[PDB]
Amino acid sequence: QSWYLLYCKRGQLQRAQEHLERQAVNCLAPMITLEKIVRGKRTAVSEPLFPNYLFVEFDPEVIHTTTINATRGVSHFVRFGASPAIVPSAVIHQLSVYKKVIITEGAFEGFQAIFTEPDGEARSMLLLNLINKEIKHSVKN
Numbered sequence: 001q002s003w004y005l006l007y008c009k010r011g012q013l014q015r016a017q018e019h020l021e022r023q024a025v026n027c028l029a030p031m032i033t034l035e036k037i038v039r040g041k042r043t044a045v046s047e048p049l050f051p052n053y054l055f056v057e058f059d060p061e062v063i064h065t066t067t068i069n070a071t072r073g074v075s076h077f078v079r080f081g082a083s084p085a086i087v088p089s090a091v092i093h094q095l096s097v098y099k100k101v102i103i104t105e106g107a108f109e110g111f112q113a114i115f116t117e118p119d120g121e122a123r124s125m126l127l128l129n130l131i132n133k134e135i136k137h138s139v140k141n
Contacts, residue, residue, distance in 0.1 A: 001059045002087045004068070005078040005131070008052040012073025017054055019071050026057040030096055036118065049114070050124045055088065078128065080135045089134050102141065106133045
């Protein structure tokens with residue numbers, strides 16, 4: 001079982017997540033509580049950490065790429081080896097929820113920045129870059 005990053009169509013993230021859950025897949029779409037200017041007011045908000053993205057935990061052999069895509073609302077999988085769909089590292093996931101020299105420093109600093117970034121679309125990029133970074137380190141190291 002490994003994690004994956006799905007990007008969802010304009011407004012089907014919610015619907016898709018339900019499906020993949022009715023199917024045995026685990027989904028994770030974090031929200032971030034931020035203080036943004038609503039109407040001249042600094043109102044606290046809860047928005048998606050990273051907009052239309054949805055992490056998915058399933059086993060390639062049991063349900064593979066192919067079928068998870070069919071899930072109504074899923075536009076695509078993020079990919080490292082361009083052919084392969086990417087596996088976020090067990091550690092990239094850890095830092096998302098509760099909270100060596102290159103995994104830690106990539107993940108660490110990476111998420112501090114993601115957690116400080118006012119809009120998610122910008123975070124998405126920062127997450128993707130961080131993921132690409134972390135995967136390379138897993139291989140080369």
